[PDB]
Amino acid sequence: CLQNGTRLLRADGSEILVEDVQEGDQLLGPDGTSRTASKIVRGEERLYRIKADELEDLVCTHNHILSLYKERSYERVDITVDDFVRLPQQEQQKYRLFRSTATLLHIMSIDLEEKPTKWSGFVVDKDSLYLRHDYLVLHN
Numbered sequence: 001c002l003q004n005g006t007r008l009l010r011a012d013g014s015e016i017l018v019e020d021v022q023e024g025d026q027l028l029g030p031d032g033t034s035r036t037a038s039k040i041v042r043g044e045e046r047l048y049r050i051k052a053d054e055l056e057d058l059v060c061t062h063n064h065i066l067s068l069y070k071e072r073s074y075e076r077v078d079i080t081v082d083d084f085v086r087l088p089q090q091e092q093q094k095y096r097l098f099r100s101t102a103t104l105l106h107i108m109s110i111d112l113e114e115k116p117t118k119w120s121g122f123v124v125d126k127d128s129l130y131l132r133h134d135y136l137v138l139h140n
Contacts, residue, residue: 001121003047003059007133011035015133019120027130030100030137035130037122044118048081051109052097055134061119065139067129069096069104078139085110099135 004019011026011034019042021027027035043061050058050066062082070077071094084092096104124130128140 001041001043001061001064001119002138004118004120006059008138009131009133009135019118021120021122027124029124029126030129030131031127033126036125037130038125039123041121042118043121044116046116047113047119048085049109049111049113050081050097050107051111052105052107055097055099055105055136058097058132058136059113059117061121064121066097067137067139068107069098070094074104081110098137100131100137101135105136 002018006018007015008018009028010016011028021037021040023038023040025037027037029035047059047061060081064081065078066081066084068077068079074096092107095107097107098104123140130138132138
């Protein structure tokens with residue numbers, strides 16, 4: 001469940017707003033093969049902004065699942081936004097967002113927004129992973 005305005009990659013490569021994703025739309029997965037979106041949902045609530053370096057922030061709901069990498073090379077970890085929020089900061093520093101091109105990105109901040117915001121979400125088939133416009137790997 002992402003903030004409205006987030007741009008995802010379609011199966012061809014072109015962009016699409018997350019609020020415009022409809023039932024059966026073809027998104028792009030991290031392995032290059034296609035993805036089918038279903039069970040579109042909308043809402044409005046105070047979201048979490050994840051500030052990473054270089055890349056545009058990731059604004060999502062508290063129950064959103066992050067696909068991250070953890071140190072000690074790296075191991076693949078899926079963790080919800082709430083649990084990651086409650087993690088100690090020295091533990092949070094061991095996690096990395098990642099994109100498909102094998103680039104790692106440090107999570108530098110994560111905070112609750114001041115005002116509510118419209119958000120859209122869906123579910124994805126296969127490995128249930130899809131790609132943001134900047135090729136950031138996102139989960140259901």
